Amino acid sequence: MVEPQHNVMQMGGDFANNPNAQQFIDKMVNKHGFDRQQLQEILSQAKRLDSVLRLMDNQGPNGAWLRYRKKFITPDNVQNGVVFWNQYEDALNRAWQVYGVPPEIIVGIIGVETRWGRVMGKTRILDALATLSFNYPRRAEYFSGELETFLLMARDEQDDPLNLKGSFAGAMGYGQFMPSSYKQYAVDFSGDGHINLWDPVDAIGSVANYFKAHGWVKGDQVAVMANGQAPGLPNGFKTKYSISQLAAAGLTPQQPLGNHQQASLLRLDVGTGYQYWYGLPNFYTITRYNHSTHYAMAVWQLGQAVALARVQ
Ligand code: NA
Secondary structure: OOOOOOOOOOOOOOOOOOHHHHHHHHHHHHHHOOOHHHHHHHHOOOOOOHHHHHHHHHOOOOOHHHHHHHHHOOHHHHHHHHHHHHHOHHHHHHHHHHHOOOHHHHHHHHHHHHOOOOOOOOEEHHHHHHHHHHOOHHHHHHHHHHHHHHHHHHHHOOOOHHHOEEOOOOOEOOOOEOHHHHHHHOOOOOOOOOOOOOOHHHHHHHHHHHHHHOOOOOOOOOEEEEEOOOOOOOOOOOOOEEHHHHHHOOOEEOOOOOOOOEEEEEEEEOOOOEEEEEEOHHHHHHHOOOOOHHHHHHHHHHHHHHHHHHHO
C-alpha cells in the first residue's frame, strides 16, 4: 500500500549528479514540507535544455524604432487586439475601475507578450527553471527562487508541475508572468477562487495589479513627444532631467506637461532622424514589465492603435 521509499535517495535524469538539485530538494523538504521522494520523481523527469542556457547568455539613424515597431503594430495585430478588447471589455473596465490602469495598456501588454494568448510558450516551465537553477551559476539564486515558487504554485493551484508550458525563462500565460510575479501580483479577477495565468480575465486583473503595484498613476500622461533636438544629452528610460534642463537643451513639449518638473529623455530612431520625447512616470512603470524603451513604446502605441480601431 503506502511506499515511503526512504531508501530511494538517488534520482536519475539530466540532473542526476547535480549538487544544486540536491541542495534545492533539501530546501523544499525542510522549508516547505515537500516529500523528498515525490520531488526526486518530478526532477528526474526535468530536462537540462541547452537552448535555455544559450538564450539566457545571448541577453544611426538607421530606423531602429521603425523596425521594432512594425513587429507589433500591424493590421493583423491591431485587428486581433480589437477582438480581444471587445471580448473582454467587462474585465478591462473593471480593472480600470479597481486599479486605475486603462484598457489600452493592458491590451497592449498582452498583445506584445503573447498576441493575446496565441503565443504563450512551448517550453515546460519545470525544464526551463530547473536548467537555470541547476546549470547556470550567473542567475542560479534568482531562478532557484522562481523554481521554489513555481512548485508551491503548482501544489496550491493543484497543477501537475510537468504539464505547464511557457517561455525559455519560465514565464507563463497571457501576460507571461514569472512565478515571483504570480506570488506577489497575480489576483483572482474572475472571482472563481483561483488564480489561473492562462485565464484571460485573471491575466487582465493580474497585469493591472502589477501596474498599480509598480506605481501606475491613473489618468496621468505616459510620455509627450518633444519638438526640437537634444543631441548633447544622454538618453534612455533610465535618464532623468528637469523640464528646465530639457528646455535649455532645445526641447519644447507638444502637449502641456502639467505639474511634472522632471522627465526621462527618450529618443526614437525614425529613419530620417531622431524623435525625442519627455518620458513621464507612467512610461517608466511600463518598463517595469520589460526594461526597454522600445518595448514600453510599442506596448503603449499598440494599445493606442487598438483603441482607435475600435472607434471605427
Ligand atoms: Na480566478
